[PDB]
Design a protein around this nucleic acid. Structure first.
Ligand SMILES: [Mg+2]
Ligand SMILES: [Mg+2]
Ligand SMILES: [Zn+2]
Ligand SMILES: [Zn+2]
Lengths: 172, 251, 251, 172
DNA sequence: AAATCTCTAGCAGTTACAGTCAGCG
DNA sequence: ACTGCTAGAGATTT
DNA sequence: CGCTGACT
DNA sequence: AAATCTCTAGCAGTTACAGTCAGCG
DNA sequence: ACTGCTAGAGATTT
DNA sequence: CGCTGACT
C-alpha cells in the first residue's frame, strides 16, 4: 500500500458541513469544519493537507465542491464509512464538553488520532546533533551510545559525552 | 590603606574614571582599582555579553503571531525540525488561539508550548485547552523576544516566501499555506538536507538589571537563583526573573 | 540538455525551490541547480554578508549631530585617537556648523571631513569654509550610517557619561564639556592605555540592490566599478553607489 | 618651562568681548567670542580648554569675570600683549573676508596657529597598528621599516608587509 | 568541483510626521 | 523558578 | 517665493 | 594575579498610540 | 567614484 | 461595568 493516499469525505452534522481526509494505509483522520460547500474552502483544505502531509493522490467523488476547477488548479500547483461514524460517535460523546461544534470536532479527531499518529510514523544506528555551553554552533554526527531521560550518552571521535536532552536531537 | 586610595575615590567620585586610569595614574594595582570601580553604583550599567540556548526538545512547540496586509497571522513551529503550522487569524483573540492549539494537538503530538506573555496566551481559555490535552503551558521573559527566537526567524522566511508567490493568489491565506508547503516539503538544508516533514517525522550579592524598556539600570537587589542564561532576584520582596544580558552581578 | 532541467525550471517557477532541493530531488548536480536559482529574479534578495573598514588616516575628522533633552549636540571626532570636540548647537543650521569647522581648524590640523549627506553639511556655507581652510569635504552613502560608524559609537559613550554626571550641573553644555574632559584625558585603554590627548598628540553583470529604506530589491543593473566595501552601478543611466551588504552581483 | 601653563586675557573688539588663552611656552593661542563679562562663560571657556588641552595652571588678573566663584568651582572640579595685538592686526586684515566678527576671530586664530600647533606637538623606533582585509581586529605592534605616502612598509614577527595608510596608525 | 568555515539582515506590538537647504520653476 | 536564530553568499581548503 | 526632494 | 581571547548593547532623524484580557474595585 | 564601531565583562591560558 | 496594568 502507498503512503500518499488520502480518501476524502464530508458529512453535515448539526446542519453544518464537515470535511474529512483519511490516510487509508493508517486510518489517520483530519476533519475540519468547512463553512460552505464549494471548491474554495475545499482547495483550501487540500492545500493545508498538501503542506501538512505529503499528498500524492486523493480519492473522491463527483461532488460539485470537488469537481470545481479551483481544486484542479490548486492541485495542479500542488502536484472509511466506519471512520466517519467513529468520529460521529466520538463527537456525540464530547459534544457536551465544548460549546462550539468545531471544537468538539477537533476533540474527536484528537481522540481518534492519539487516544494513528505513530502509525504514519511507522509508515516512513542513530545520529545525534548537540550544542555545548556558550557555543551555539551545532555539532557533528555523534554516535548514540544510550538515550536517557533528561540526559543522553553520546560518542564523538574522541569523547564520550553527557548532554542534557534540552541540547540534543536524535535522527536516524 | 594608602592615601592614593582616598584621592582615587575622590577622583572617581568626581570623574567616574575607569580602572586603568586610576590604576596607572595614581600608581595603584588593577585589583583595588576594579574594587573602587565596582564599589560605585552609577558606572555599573553594562551586562554580561552572552546569549543563551533555547530548550530544543521534541515535545516543544513555539507559537506567536505577526502582522501583514492588515491581517494577523498565527504561526506554530516545531523547535527541532523547523516545521510550520501557520494560518491566518481573522481577528486575534484568545478563543481562536485555543481552537488552533486544539487543531495542532489533533494532528501533531504536543507536550508543552513555549511562547511569550502576550494577551491571548495567558487567557483562561488557552489554559483549559492545554489542560484538556495534557499540554504544559510555558512562558518566557516579556521583553526578551530572543527567548522565542526560533519562531521569530521563521516569520522572516515566511514573509520572504510571500514575497515570491503573492502573485499566485487572489487571497492571503492561500499564499500563506503555499509558503508552508514550500518551506516544509520543498526546501531542504540544515540537518542533513531534509525538508521539515522528513525531520519532524524522523524525530517523532548586589545585582543590577533593567526591564520595562527602561534604560535606567536598577539598584542593588538580592540574587535568589543562578542558572544558565537567566537569573532570579529580589528587590524588596520583588521576586523576578532577568536574562543575563540585561543584568550584572556583584559577588 | 536533460528533461530534468525543464521540469526543474517548472518546479522552480512554481515553488522557487533552492538549489539543494532541485538538485537532490530531480537527481541533478549542484552547479546547474545554482544556475537555475541564479537564473531567477525573485529569489535574489540577500546580499554579501560582510562589513568594510572605514578609512583611518590622520587628516580625517568625523562629524555628526545628535539629540538630547530637546537640544541638538554637534560632535567632531578624530578617527585614530578617539578624541572629541563636542559642543551644543542652540538650533541646528549650516552656518553654525561652518563656524564650528572654523573653530576646529583653528585648533586642530584638519585635512578632510567624512560625514553624511545630512542637510547642513551639503550647504554652500560649509563648502566655502572648508574651501578657505584647505579642507576636503567628503561624503558617504545616505542610508548606511555604519559608514560613519566611529562617531555613532562615540554618541553612545558620550550619552553614557552624561548618565553619570548630569547631577553636577544646572545646564547641559557644561556637562557636555565635562564628559569631553573625562573621555579625552581621564579614561584610558584601546591602543596602549592612552587617553585621547596622548594618542591625538602622538599621531600629530546583473547587480541587484536596494536603497531608500525600500526592501524591494532592485532589478538588474550594470556594474560600473568594484572596490573593497562598495560598488558603483548603472540602471538606465542611473549612476549610483551601493554598499556591498545591500547588493548582490551576477557574474 | 612647564607645558600646562596658560595665560588668560580679554579684549573688546567692536564693543564685543573676546576671551583668549595663550600657551606661554609655545605662544599657542585660542580666542573665542564671549557674549558677556561673567564667570559663567568664563568657566565655560576654561572648561572647554580643560578638555581640549591638559591645563594645570592659569595666570590671570583680578577681573570680576575671573574671581567669580563659579570659576573656582569648575576649576576645582577640573584640577602676550604682542600676541593680543598680533591677533588684533590679523582680525583687522580678514575682517572684510567674513561678515560675522566671531568668524574672522577664529580665522585669525587659524592664521596665527597654522599659517604653534606643531610647537605644542614639540612640547610633548616607532610602533604600528594595522588591519587586513575583512578582519576588523586591530593587529599587534608592527616594527615600522618605512613610512610611505599611501602605503607603509611594516614588519611583524615573520612577515614584512605592505599596508595602505588608510589601514594604519603610527605611534611612538 | 566538493566541503567546510565565516559572517550578516531581520525577526521581533508599529509610523507618519519634523527640520534644513540646494536646486528647479 | 530560564536561556537567539535561521538561511543564504563568499572564502578557502580537500 | 514656493516647494520639492532628499537626507537626517 | 597578569594577559589574552571572545562576545554583545546601542549608536544610528523619533514615538505616542492600538489590541487583548486577568485581575482588582 | 567607497568601506562598523567602541568599550566593558567574562573565560581562559601564562 | 470600568478600568488598569501589562505585554504585545
Ligand atoms: Mg510574540
Ligand atoms: Mg548623521
Ligand atoms: Zn564611578
Ligand atoms: Zn525561484
Amino acid at each position: 500500500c502507498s503512503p500518499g493516499i488520502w480518501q476524502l469525505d464530508c458529512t453535515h452534522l448539526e446542519g453544518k458541513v464537515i470535511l474529512v481526509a483519511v490516510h487509508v494505509a493508517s486510518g489517520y483522520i483530519e476533519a475540519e469544519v468547512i463553512p460552505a460547500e464549494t471548491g474554495q474552502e475545499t482547495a483550501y483544505f487540500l492545500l493545508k493537507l498538501a503542506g501538512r502531509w505529503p499528498v500524492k493522490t486523493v480519492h473522491t467523488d463527483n461532488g460539485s465542491n470537488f469537481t470545481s476547477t479551483t481544486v484542479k488548479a490548486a492541485c495542479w500547483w500542488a502536484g472509511i464509512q466506519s471512520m466517519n461514524k467513529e468520529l460521529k460517535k466520538i463527537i456525540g460523546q464530547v459534544r457536551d464538553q465544548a460549546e462550539h461544534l468545531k471544537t468538539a470536532v477537533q476533540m474527536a479527531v484528537f481522540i481518534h488520532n492519539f487516544k494513528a499518529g505513530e502509525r504514519i510514523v511507522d509508515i516512513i544506528n542513530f545520529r545525534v546533533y548537540y550544542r555545548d555551553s556558550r557555543d551555539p554552533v551545532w555539532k557533528g554526527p555523534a554516535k548514540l551510545l544510550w538515550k536517557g531521560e533528561g540526559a543522553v550518552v553520546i560518542q564523538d571521535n574522541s569523547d564520550i559525552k553527557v548532554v542534557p536532552r534540552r541540547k540534543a536531537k536524535i535522527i536516524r | 590603606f594608602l592615601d592614593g586610595i582616598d584621592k582615587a575615590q575622590e577622583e572617581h567620585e568626581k570623574y567616574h574614571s575607569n580602572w586603568r586610569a586610576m590604576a596607572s595614574d595614581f600608581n595603584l594595582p588593577p585589583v583595588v582599582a576594579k574594587e573602587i570601580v565596582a564599589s560605585c553604583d552609577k558606572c555599573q550599567l553594562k551586562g554580561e555579553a552572552m546569549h543563551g540556548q533555547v530548550d530544543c526538545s521534541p515535545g516543544i512547540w513555539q507559537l506567536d503571531c505577526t502582522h501583514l496586509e492588515g491581517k494577523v497571522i498565527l504561526v506554530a513551529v516545531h523547535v527541532a525540525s523547523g516545521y510550520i503550522e501557520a494560518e491566518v487569524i481573522p481577528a486575534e483573540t484568545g478563543q481562536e488561539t485555543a481552537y488552533f492549539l486544539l487543531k495542532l494537538a489533533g494532528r501533531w503530538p504536543v507536550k508543552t508550548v513555549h511562547t511569550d506573555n502576550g494577551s491571548n496566551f495567558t487567557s483562561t481559555t488557552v489554559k483549559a485547552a492545554c489542560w484538556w490535552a495534557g499540554i504544559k503551558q510555558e512562558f518566557g521573559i516579556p521583553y526578551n523576544p530572543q527567548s522565542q527566537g526560533v519562531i521569530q526567524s521563521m516569520n522572516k522566511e515566511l514573509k520572504k516566501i510571500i514575497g515570491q508567490v503573492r502573485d499566485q493568489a487572489e487571497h492571503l491565506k492561500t499564499a500563506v499555506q503555499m509558503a508552508v508547503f514550500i518551506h516544509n516539503f520543498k526546501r531542504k538544508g540544515g540537518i542533513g538536507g531534509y525538508s521539515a516533514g522528513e525531520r519532524i517525522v524522523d524525530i517523532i550579592f548586589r545585582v543590577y538589571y533593567r526591564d520595562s524598556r527602561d534604560p535606567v539600570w536598577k539598584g542593588p537587589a538580592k540574587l535568589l537563583w543562578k542558572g544558565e542564561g537567566a537569573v532570579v532576584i529580589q528587590d524588596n520582596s520583588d521576586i523576578k526573573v532577568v536574562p543575563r544580558r540585561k543584568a550584572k552581578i556583584i559577588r
